[PDB]
């Protein structure tokens, strides 16, 4: 089968019309079907006094969209990370910088919360830990919807802020860091953990309802107390340990297979947010945009689509 991109996509659509792998195809067929609609629209415009000038504009517009879709299509048939279509657990922690680092963690949380709104996703904050002066020591959230990991997977790492603290009178720019970790949601079914490998402490932050679970082989610990029942706190804690433990080991297995955009090191500064310059830079793909205001407000697609494209270009080239 020495078949080209269009053959492959037509083969997908035919397999789609034959058809739980229908959802796997859904997004691709709608893109190819829309590309075929554009190609018809160009043929239509070529058949259609100032109406001639009108249709010539419509043709140019159609032709330009074909170029845009052509670029889209090449990457559609790439092999997907099977986690791409998963919901994710999101964690943000103020790291270096003090109060300013906790503020920025809050800024990031707001950004993802606004982005998640934009994307039509559900954003549950599962637990969060404030510093009692407007700052976020850490937060863990779950983000759910269509292919959430496929879009947020690149947020894992150290996010540097440079800004003049509101407390600062002398115009000095303080640099801080908040860390972000994004991990796919792992179903109990998919990743079983022997209770022998768990310590579950139940304690009062009446029935004690605060729950600490420590996965003993890794010393991964989670503490949940927000909920009114032990069961609720246990279950939340367990979703998070499962994710963290599966991620722990997926990371070692990635590391064994050395010899992906960025390093894959999650302590690496991946991004810098400079307030004075209204700048966001993503250090992995040499991208700087003077759009920090709108990025922090949740308009993060331009940045994410850049990363996706960089990765897809990488993956496509190495597939030669």
mmCIF file with all atom_site columns, C-alpha atoms in Angstrom, residues 43-231:
data_model
loop_
_atom_site.group_PDB
_atom_site.id
_atom_site.type_symbol
_atom_site.label_atom_id
_atom_site.label_alt_id
_atom_site.label_comp_id
_atom_site.label_asym_id
_atom_site.label_entity_id
_atom_site.label_seq_id
_atom_site.pdbx_PDB_ins_code
_atom_site.Cartn_x
_atom_site.Cartn_y
_atom_site.Cartn_z
_atom_site.occupancy
_atom_site.B_iso_or_equiv
_atom_site.pdbx_formal_charge
_atom_site.auth_seq_id
_atom_site.auth_comp_id
_atom_site.auth_asym_id
_atom_site.auth_atom_id
_atom_site.pdbx_PDB_model_num
ATOM 1   C CA . UNK A 1 43  ? -14.067 24.063 -8.176  1.00 0.00 ? 43  UNK A CA 1
ATOM 2   C CA . UNK A 1 44  ? -17.446 25.814 -7.691  1.00 0.00 ? 44  UNK A CA 1
ATOM 3   C CA . UNK A 1 45  ? -15.831 29.286 -7.677  1.00 0.00 ? 45  UNK A CA 1
ATOM 4   C CA . UNK A 1 46  ? -13.978 28.386 -10.893 1.00 0.00 ? 46  UNK A CA 1
ATOM 5   C CA . UNK A 1 47  ? -17.368 27.739 -12.584 1.00 0.00 ? 47  UNK A CA 1
ATOM 6   C CA . UNK A 1 48  ? -19.069 30.868 -11.095 1.00 0.00 ? 48  UNK A CA 1
ATOM 7   C CA . UNK A 1 49  ? -20.176 41.767 -14.077 1.00 0.00 ? 49  UNK A CA 1
ATOM 8   C CA . UNK A 1 50  ? -18.873 42.605 -10.571 1.00 0.00 ? 50  UNK A CA 1
ATOM 9   C CA . UNK A 1 51  ? -20.186 39.154 -9.610  1.00 0.00 ? 51  UNK A CA 1
ATOM 10  C CA . UNK A 1 52  ? -17.129 37.848 -11.496 1.00 0.00 ? 52  UNK A CA 1
ATOM 11  C CA . UNK A 1 53  ? -14.904 39.986 -9.235  1.00 0.00 ? 53  UNK A CA 1
ATOM 12  C CA . UNK A 1 54  ? -16.912 38.779 -6.214  1.00 0.00 ? 54  UNK A CA 1
ATOM 13  C CA . UNK A 1 55  ? -16.463 35.080 -7.070  1.00 0.00 ? 55  UNK A CA 1
ATOM 14  C CA . UNK A 1 56  ? -12.747 35.695 -7.777  1.00 0.00 ? 56  UNK A CA 1
ATOM 15  C CA . UNK A 1 57  ? -12.399 36.901 -4.161  1.00 0.00 ? 57  UNK A CA 1
ATOM 16  C CA . UNK A 1 58  ? -14.351 33.896 -2.885  1.00 0.00 ? 58  UNK A CA 1
ATOM 17  C CA . UNK A 1 59  ? -11.998 31.675 -4.902  1.00 0.00 ? 59  UNK A CA 1
ATOM 18  C CA . UNK A 1 60  ? -8.878  33.307 -3.414  1.00 0.00 ? 60  UNK A CA 1
ATOM 19  C CA . UNK A 1 61  ? -10.397 32.853 0.073   1.00 0.00 ? 61  UNK A CA 1
ATOM 20  C CA . UNK A 1 62  ? -11.202 29.184 -0.653  1.00 0.00 ? 62  UNK A CA 1
ATOM 21  C CA . UNK A 1 63  ? -7.714  28.571 -2.111  1.00 0.00 ? 63  UNK A CA 1
ATOM 22  C CA . UNK A 1 64  ? -6.108  30.053 1.031   1.00 0.00 ? 64  UNK A CA 1
ATOM 23  C CA . UNK A 1 65  ? -8.123  27.723 3.276   1.00 0.00 ? 65  UNK A CA 1
ATOM 24  C CA . UNK A 1 66  ? -7.000  24.720 1.227   1.00 0.00 ? 66  UNK A CA 1
ATOM 25  C CA . UNK A 1 67  ? -3.385  25.760 1.960   1.00 0.00 ? 67  UNK A CA 1
ATOM 26  C CA . UNK A 1 68  ? -4.302  25.957 5.658   1.00 0.00 ? 68  UNK A CA 1
ATOM 27  C CA . UNK A 1 69  ? -5.965  22.531 5.646   1.00 0.00 ? 69  UNK A CA 1
ATOM 28  C CA . UNK A 1 70  ? -3.151  20.965 3.592   1.00 0.00 ? 70  UNK A CA 1
ATOM 29  C CA . UNK A 1 71  ? -0.844  21.884 6.493   1.00 0.00 ? 71  UNK A CA 1
ATOM 30  C CA . UNK A 1 72  ? -3.357  20.330 8.913   1.00 0.00 ? 72  UNK A CA 1
ATOM 31  C CA . UNK A 1 73  ? -3.746  17.040 7.009   1.00 0.00 ? 73  UNK A CA 1
ATOM 32  C CA . UNK A 1 74  ? -0.139  15.835 6.899   1.00 0.00 ? 74  UNK A CA 1
ATOM 33  C CA . UNK A 1 75  ? -0.089  15.528 10.710  1.00 0.00 ? 75  UNK A CA 1
ATOM 34  C CA . UNK A 1 76  ? -3.506  13.854 11.124  1.00 0.00 ? 76  UNK A CA 1
ATOM 35  C CA . UNK A 1 77  ? -2.209  10.347 10.374  1.00 0.00 ? 77  UNK A CA 1
ATOM 36  C CA . UNK A 1 78  ? 0.622   10.642 12.923  1.00 0.00 ? 78  UNK A CA 1
ATOM 37  C CA . UNK A 1 79  ? 0.733   8.058  15.729  1.00 0.00 ? 79  UNK A CA 1
ATOM 38  C CA . UNK A 1 80  ? -1.044  9.478  18.790  1.00 0.00 ? 80  UNK A CA 1
ATOM 39  C CA . UNK A 1 81  ? 0.162   9.217  22.361  1.00 0.00 ? 81  UNK A CA 1
ATOM 40  C CA . UNK A 1 82  ? -2.676  7.030  23.672  1.00 0.00 ? 82  UNK A CA 1
ATOM 41  C CA . UNK A 1 83  ? -3.039  9.416  26.614  1.00 0.00 ? 83  UNK A CA 1
ATOM 42  C CA . UNK A 1 84  ? -3.901  12.336 24.278  1.00 0.00 ? 84  UNK A CA 1
ATOM 43  C CA . UNK A 1 85  ? -7.650  11.785 24.578  1.00 0.00 ? 85  UNK A CA 1
ATOM 44  C CA . UNK A 1 86  ? -7.596  11.556 28.418  1.00 0.00 ? 86  UNK A CA 1
ATOM 45  C CA . UNK A 1 87  ? -8.743  13.955 31.096  1.00 0.00 ? 87  UNK A CA 1
ATOM 46  C CA . UNK A 1 88  ? -5.890  15.190 33.274  1.00 0.00 ? 88  UNK A CA 1
ATOM 47  C CA . UNK A 1 89  ? -4.905  15.867 36.857  1.00 0.00 ? 89  UNK A CA 1
ATOM 48  C CA . UNK A 1 90  ? -3.328  19.323 37.076  1.00 0.00 ? 90  UNK A CA 1
ATOM 49  C CA . UNK A 1 91  ? -1.009  20.418 39.887  1.00 0.00 ? 91  UNK A CA 1
ATOM 50  C CA . UNK A 1 92  ? 0.480   23.876 40.421  1.00 0.00 ? 92  UNK A CA 1
ATOM 51  C CA . UNK A 1 93  ? 2.873   24.831 43.255  1.00 0.00 ? 93  UNK A CA 1
ATOM 52  C CA . UNK A 1 94  ? 4.547   28.102 44.140  1.00 0.00 ? 94  UNK A CA 1
ATOM 53  C CA . UNK A 1 95  ? 8.229   27.164 44.021  1.00 0.00 ? 95  UNK A CA 1
ATOM 54  C CA . UNK A 1 96  ? 11.079  29.729 44.280  1.00 0.00 ? 96  UNK A CA 1
ATOM 55  C CA . UNK A 1 97  ? 10.204  33.407 44.918  1.00 0.00 ? 97  UNK A CA 1
ATOM 56  C CA . UNK A 1 98  ? 8.184   33.437 48.138  1.00 0.00 ? 98  UNK A CA 1
ATOM 57  C CA . UNK A 1 99  ? 4.803   35.172 48.195  1.00 0.00 ? 99  UNK A CA 1
ATOM 58  C CA . UNK A 1 100 ? 5.256   36.245 44.587  1.00 0.00 ? 100 UNK A CA 1
ATOM 59  C CA . UNK A 1 101 ? 5.598   32.596 43.586  1.00 0.00 ? 101 UNK A CA 1
ATOM 60  C CA . UNK A 1 102 ? 2.261   31.760 45.266  1.00 0.00 ? 102 UNK A CA 1
ATOM 61  C CA . UNK A 1 103 ? 0.570   34.740 43.582  1.00 0.00 ? 103 UNK A CA 1
ATOM 62  C CA . UNK A 1 104 ? 1.827   33.491 40.182  1.00 0.00 ? 104 UNK A CA 1
ATOM 63  C CA . UNK A 1 105 ? 0.625   29.971 40.898  1.00 0.00 ? 105 UNK A CA 1
ATOM 64  C CA . UNK A 1 106 ? -2.761  31.636 41.337  1.00 0.00 ? 106 UNK A CA 1
ATOM 65  C CA . UNK A 1 107 ? -2.286  33.482 38.059  1.00 0.00 ? 107 UNK A CA 1
ATOM 66  C CA . UNK A 1 108 ? -1.576  30.176 36.303  1.00 0.00 ? 108 UNK A CA 1
ATOM 67  C CA . UNK A 1 109 ? -4.583  28.555 37.907  1.00 0.00 ? 109 UNK A CA 1
ATOM 68  C CA . UNK A 1 110 ? -6.794  31.364 36.651  1.00 0.00 ? 110 UNK A CA 1
ATOM 69  C CA . UNK A 1 111 ? -5.307  31.008 33.172  1.00 0.00 ? 111 UNK A CA 1
ATOM 70  C CA . UNK A 1 112 ? -6.034  27.298 32.928  1.00 0.00 ? 112 UNK A CA 1
ATOM 71  C CA . UNK A 1 113 ? -9.446  27.822 34.475  1.00 0.00 ? 113 UNK A CA 1
ATOM 72  C CA . UNK A 1 114 ? -10.215 30.426 31.786  1.00 0.00 ? 114 UNK A CA 1
ATOM 73  C CA . UNK A 1 115 ? -8.720  28.245 29.051  1.00 0.00 ? 115 UNK A CA 1
ATOM 74  C CA . UNK A 1 116 ? -10.724 25.287 30.265  1.00 0.00 ? 116 UNK A CA 1
ATOM 75  C CA . UNK A 1 117 ? -13.860 27.464 30.053  1.00 0.00 ? 117 UNK A CA 1
ATOM 76  C CA . UNK A 1 118 ? -12.881 28.464 26.471  1.00 0.00 ? 118 UNK A CA 1
ATOM 77  C CA . UNK A 1 119 ? -12.312 24.801 25.512  1.00 0.00 ? 119 UNK A CA 1
ATOM 78  C CA . UNK A 1 120 ? -15.685 23.742 26.953  1.00 0.00 ? 120 UNK A CA 1
ATOM 79  C CA . UNK A 1 121 ? -13.987 21.588 29.607  1.00 0.00 ? 121 UNK A CA 1
ATOM 80  C CA . UNK A 1 122 ? -14.896 20.923 33.246  1.00 0.00 ? 122 UNK A CA 1
ATOM 81  C CA . UNK A 1 123 ? -12.353 22.235 35.734  1.00 0.00 ? 123 UNK A CA 1
ATOM 82  C CA . UNK A 1 124 ? -12.743 20.850 39.281  1.00 0.00 ? 124 UNK A CA 1
ATOM 83  C CA . UNK A 1 125 ? -10.360 22.121 41.917  1.00 0.00 ? 125 UNK A CA 1
ATOM 84  C CA . UNK A 1 126 ? -9.951  19.015 44.050  1.00 0.00 ? 126 UNK A CA 1
ATOM 85  C CA . UNK A 1 127 ? -7.858  20.552 46.743  1.00 0.00 ? 127 UNK A CA 1
ATOM 86  C CA . UNK A 1 128 ? -5.977  23.774 47.202  1.00 0.00 ? 128 UNK A CA 1
ATOM 87  C CA . UNK A 1 129 ? -3.751  25.296 49.812  1.00 0.00 ? 129 UNK A CA 1
ATOM 88  C CA . UNK A 1 130 ? -3.715  29.110 50.244  1.00 0.00 ? 130 UNK A CA 1
ATOM 89  C CA . UNK A 1 131 ? -0.971  31.159 51.996  1.00 0.00 ? 131 UNK A CA 1
ATOM 90  C CA . UNK A 1 132 ? -3.448  33.506 53.691  1.00 0.00 ? 132 UNK A CA 1
ATOM 91  C CA . UNK A 1 133 ? -2.444  36.602 51.735  1.00 0.00 ? 133 UNK A CA 1
ATOM 92  C CA . UNK A 1 134 ? -4.001  35.962 48.304  1.00 0.00 ? 134 UNK A CA 1
ATOM 93  C CA . UNK A 1 135 ? -1.481  33.326 47.231  1.00 0.00 ? 135 UNK A CA 1
ATOM 94  C CA . UNK A 1 136 ? -1.664  29.671 46.296  1.00 0.00 ? 136 UNK A CA 1
ATOM 95  C CA . UNK A 1 137 ? 0.803   27.331 48.048  1.00 0.00 ? 137 UNK A CA 1
ATOM 96  C CA . UNK A 1 138 ? -0.465  24.506 45.852  1.00 0.00 ? 138 UNK A CA 1
ATOM 97  C CA . UNK A 1 139 ? -3.521  23.359 43.961  1.00 0.00 ? 139 UNK A CA 1
ATOM 98  C CA . UNK A 1 140 ? -4.584  20.071 42.404  1.00 0.00 ? 140 UNK A CA 1
ATOM 99  C CA . UNK A 1 141 ? -7.394  20.078 39.917  1.00 0.00 ? 141 UNK A CA 1
ATOM 100 C CA . UNK A 1 142 ? -8.950  17.754 37.475  1.00 0.00 ? 142 UNK A CA 1
ATOM 101 C CA . UNK A 1 143 ? -9.629  18.929 33.926  1.00 0.00 ? 143 UNK A CA 1
ATOM 102 C CA . UNK A 1 144 ? -12.028 16.841 31.863  1.00 0.00 ? 144 UNK A CA 1
ATOM 103 C CA . UNK A 1 145 ? -13.417 16.961 28.313  1.00 0.00 ? 145 UNK A CA 1
ATOM 104 C CA . UNK A 1 146 ? -12.387 16.125 24.730  1.00 0.00 ? 146 UNK A CA 1
ATOM 105 C CA . UNK A 1 147 ? -8.659  15.258 24.466  1.00 0.00 ? 147 UNK A CA 1
ATOM 106 C CA . UNK A 1 148 ? -7.584  17.458 27.373  1.00 0.00 ? 148 UNK A CA 1
ATOM 107 C CA . UNK A 1 149 ? -4.105  15.935 27.696  1.00 0.00 ? 149 UNK A CA 1
ATOM 108 C CA . UNK A 1 150 ? -3.439  16.397 23.969  1.00 0.00 ? 150 UNK A CA 1
ATOM 109 C CA . UNK A 1 151 ? -3.549  20.140 24.704  1.00 0.00 ? 151 UNK A CA 1
ATOM 110 C CA . UNK A 1 152 ? -2.198  20.499 28.234  1.00 0.00 ? 152 UNK A CA 1
ATOM 111 C CA . UNK A 1 153 ? 0.599   18.005 28.214  1.00 0.00 ? 153 UNK A CA 1
ATOM 112 C CA . UNK A 1 154 ? 3.145   20.706 27.403  1.00 0.00 ? 154 UNK A CA 1
ATOM 113 C CA . UNK A 1 155 ? 2.335   22.700 30.577  1.00 0.00 ? 155 UNK A CA 1
ATOM 114 C CA . UNK A 1 156 ? 4.439   20.370 32.709  1.00 0.00 ? 156 UNK A CA 1
ATOM 115 C CA . UNK A 1 157 ? 7.507   22.197 33.954  1.00 0.00 ? 157 UNK A CA 1
ATOM 116 C CA . UNK A 1 158 ? 8.776   25.333 35.686  1.00 0.00 ? 158 UNK A CA 1
ATOM 117 C CA . UNK A 1 159 ? 7.074   28.585 34.718  1.00 0.00 ? 159 UNK A CA 1
ATOM 118 C CA . UNK A 1 160 ? 9.120   31.667 35.492  1.00 0.00 ? 160 UNK A CA 1
ATOM 119 C CA . UNK A 1 161 ? 7.501   34.998 36.288  1.00 0.00 ? 161 UNK A CA 1
ATOM 120 C CA . UNK A 1 162 ? 9.331   38.367 36.076  1.00 0.00 ? 162 UNK A CA 1
ATOM 121 C CA . UNK A 1 163 ? 7.390   41.309 37.414  1.00 0.00 ? 163 UNK A CA 1
ATOM 122 C CA . UNK A 1 164 ? 7.456   44.200 39.805  1.00 0.00 ? 164 UNK A CA 1
ATOM 123 C CA . UNK A 1 165 ? 5.638   42.972 42.916  1.00 0.00 ? 165 UNK A CA 1
ATOM 124 C CA . UNK A 1 166 ? 2.685   45.125 44.014  1.00 0.00 ? 166 UNK A CA 1
ATOM 125 C CA . UNK A 1 167 ? 4.571   45.461 47.311  1.00 0.00 ? 167 UNK A CA 1
ATOM 126 C CA . UNK A 1 168 ? 7.656   46.902 45.533  1.00 0.00 ? 168 UNK A CA 1
ATOM 127 C CA . UNK A 1 169 ? 8.112   50.680 45.409  1.00 0.00 ? 169 UNK A CA 1
ATOM 128 C CA . UNK A 1 170 ? 11.519  50.868 43.661  1.00 0.00 ? 170 UNK A CA 1
ATOM 129 C CA . UNK A 1 171 ? 10.632  49.259 40.347  1.00 0.00 ? 171 UNK A CA 1
ATOM 130 C CA . UNK A 1 172 ? 12.709  46.147 40.914  1.00 0.00 ? 172 UNK A CA 1
ATOM 131 C CA . UNK A 1 173 ? 11.667  43.156 38.893  1.00 0.00 ? 173 UNK A CA 1
ATOM 132 C CA . UNK A 1 174 ? 11.346  40.041 41.034  1.00 0.00 ? 174 UNK A CA 1
ATOM 133 C CA . UNK A 1 175 ? 11.758  36.645 39.411  1.00 0.00 ? 175 UNK A CA 1
ATOM 134 C CA . UNK A 1 176 ? 9.703   33.704 40.725  1.00 0.00 ? 176 UNK A CA 1
ATOM 135 C CA . UNK A 1 177 ? 8.751   30.203 39.687  1.00 0.00 ? 177 UNK A CA 1
ATOM 136 C CA . UNK A 1 178 ? 5.672   28.071 39.955  1.00 0.00 ? 178 UNK A CA 1
ATOM 137 C CA . UNK A 1 179 ? 5.793   24.436 38.821  1.00 0.00 ? 179 UNK A CA 1
ATOM 138 C CA . UNK A 1 180 ? 3.065   22.780 36.810  1.00 0.00 ? 180 UNK A CA 1
ATOM 139 C CA . UNK A 1 181 ? 2.543   19.065 36.433  1.00 0.00 ? 181 UNK A CA 1
ATOM 140 C CA . UNK A 1 182 ? -0.092  17.659 34.059  1.00 0.00 ? 182 UNK A CA 1
ATOM 141 C CA . UNK A 1 183 ? -0.732  13.908 34.156  1.00 0.00 ? 183 UNK A CA 1
ATOM 142 C CA . UNK A 1 184 ? -3.382  11.805 32.460  1.00 0.00 ? 184 UNK A CA 1
ATOM 143 C CA . UNK A 1 185 ? -6.248  10.588 34.605  1.00 0.00 ? 185 UNK A CA 1
ATOM 144 C CA . UNK A 1 186 ? -5.735  6.879  35.323  1.00 0.00 ? 186 UNK A CA 1
ATOM 145 C CA . UNK A 1 187 ? -8.791  4.634  35.847  1.00 0.00 ? 187 UNK A CA 1
ATOM 146 C CA . UNK A 1 188 ? -8.633  2.153  38.739  1.00 0.00 ? 188 UNK A CA 1
ATOM 147 C CA . UNK A 1 189 ? -9.238  -0.520 36.091  1.00 0.00 ? 189 UNK A CA 1
ATOM 148 C CA . UNK A 1 190 ? -6.145  0.592  34.119  1.00 0.00 ? 190 UNK A CA 1
ATOM 149 C CA . UNK A 1 191 ? -3.662  0.678  37.009  1.00 0.00 ? 191 UNK A CA 1
ATOM 150 C CA . UNK A 1 192 ? -4.171  -1.585 39.987  1.00 0.00 ? 192 UNK A CA 1
ATOM 151 C CA . UNK A 1 193 ? -2.389  -0.973 43.251  1.00 0.00 ? 193 UNK A CA 1
ATOM 152 C CA . UNK A 1 194 ? -2.160  -3.614 45.915  1.00 0.00 ? 194 UNK A CA 1
ATOM 153 C CA . UNK A 1 195 ? -3.268  -2.191 49.261  1.00 0.00 ? 195 UNK A CA 1
ATOM 154 C CA . UNK A 1 196 ? -0.219  -3.934 50.744  1.00 0.00 ? 196 UNK A CA 1
ATOM 155 C CA . UNK A 1 197 ? 1.664   -1.156 48.920  1.00 0.00 ? 197 UNK A CA 1
ATOM 156 C CA . UNK A 1 198 ? -0.453  1.568  50.579  1.00 0.00 ? 198 UNK A CA 1
ATOM 157 C CA . UNK A 1 199 ? -0.521  3.296  53.874  1.00 0.00 ? 199 UNK A CA 1
ATOM 158 C CA . UNK A 1 200 ? -3.933  4.894  54.442  1.00 0.00 ? 200 UNK A CA 1
ATOM 159 C CA . UNK A 1 201 ? -4.149  7.187  57.438  1.00 0.00 ? 201 UNK A CA 1
ATOM 160 C CA . UNK A 1 202 ? -7.589  8.431  58.424  1.00 0.00 ? 202 UNK A CA 1
ATOM 161 C CA . UNK A 1 203 ? -7.482  11.448 60.785  1.00 0.00 ? 203 UNK A CA 1
ATOM 162 C CA . UNK A 1 204 ? -9.260  14.647 61.951  1.00 0.00 ? 204 UNK A CA 1
ATOM 163 C CA . UNK A 1 205 ? -7.910  17.643 59.979  1.00 0.00 ? 205 UNK A CA 1
ATOM 164 C CA . UNK A 1 206 ? -17.424 12.390 64.780  1.00 0.00 ? 206 UNK A CA 1
ATOM 165 C CA . UNK A 1 207 ? -15.961 10.143 62.084  1.00 0.00 ? 207 UNK A CA 1
ATOM 166 C CA . UNK A 1 208 ? -12.429 11.143 61.058  1.00 0.00 ? 208 UNK A CA 1
ATOM 167 C CA . UNK A 1 209 ? -12.690 12.137 57.407  1.00 0.00 ? 209 UNK A CA 1
ATOM 168 C CA . UNK A 1 210 ? -9.302  13.485 56.371  1.00 0.00 ? 210 UNK A CA 1
ATOM 169 C CA . UNK A 1 211 ? -7.352  10.903 54.414  1.00 0.00 ? 211 UNK A CA 1
ATOM 170 C CA . UNK A 1 212 ? -3.611  10.560 53.762  1.00 0.00 ? 212 UNK A CA 1
ATOM 171 C CA . UNK A 1 213 ? -2.573  7.847  51.333  1.00 0.00 ? 213 UNK A CA 1
ATOM 172 C CA . UNK A 1 214 ? 1.102   7.042  50.909  1.00 0.00 ? 214 UNK A CA 1
ATOM 173 C CA . UNK A 1 215 ? 2.200   4.667  48.121  1.00 0.00 ? 215 UNK A CA 1
ATOM 174 C CA . UNK A 1 216 ? 4.955   2.889  49.940  1.00 0.00 ? 216 UNK A CA 1
ATOM 175 C CA . UNK A 1 217 ? 7.124   1.688  47.051  1.00 0.00 ? 217 UNK A CA 1
ATOM 176 C CA . UNK A 1 218 ? 7.519   5.263  45.789  1.00 0.00 ? 218 UNK A CA 1
ATOM 177 C CA . UNK A 1 219 ? 6.809   7.319  48.938  1.00 0.00 ? 219 UNK A CA 1
ATOM 178 C CA . UNK A 1 220 ? 4.247   9.244  46.893  1.00 0.00 ? 220 UNK A CA 1
ATOM 179 C CA . UNK A 1 221 ? 1.849   10.862 49.393  1.00 0.00 ? 221 UNK A CA 1
ATOM 180 C CA . UNK A 1 222 ? -1.516  12.518 48.975  1.00 0.00 ? 222 UNK A CA 1
ATOM 181 C CA . UNK A 1 223 ? -3.637  14.228 51.609  1.00 0.00 ? 223 UNK A CA 1
ATOM 182 C CA . UNK A 1 224 ? -7.293  15.098 51.052  1.00 0.00 ? 224 UNK A CA 1
ATOM 183 C CA . UNK A 1 225 ? -9.473  16.750 53.662  1.00 0.00 ? 225 UNK A CA 1
ATOM 184 C CA . UNK A 1 226 ? -11.856 19.198 51.932  1.00 0.00 ? 226 UNK A CA 1
ATOM 185 C CA . UNK A 1 227 ? -14.777 16.728 51.598  1.00 0.00 ? 227 UNK A CA 1
ATOM 186 C CA . UNK A 1 228 ? -17.402 15.979 54.285  1.00 0.00 ? 228 UNK A CA 1
ATOM 187 C CA . UNK A 1 229 ? -16.838 12.200 54.136  1.00 0.00 ? 229 UNK A CA 1
ATOM 188 C CA . UNK A 1 230 ? -13.866 9.899  54.461  1.00 0.00 ? 230 UNK A CA 1
ATOM 189 C CA . UNK A 1 231 ? -14.980 8.056  51.328  1.00 0.00 ? 231 UNK A CA 1
#
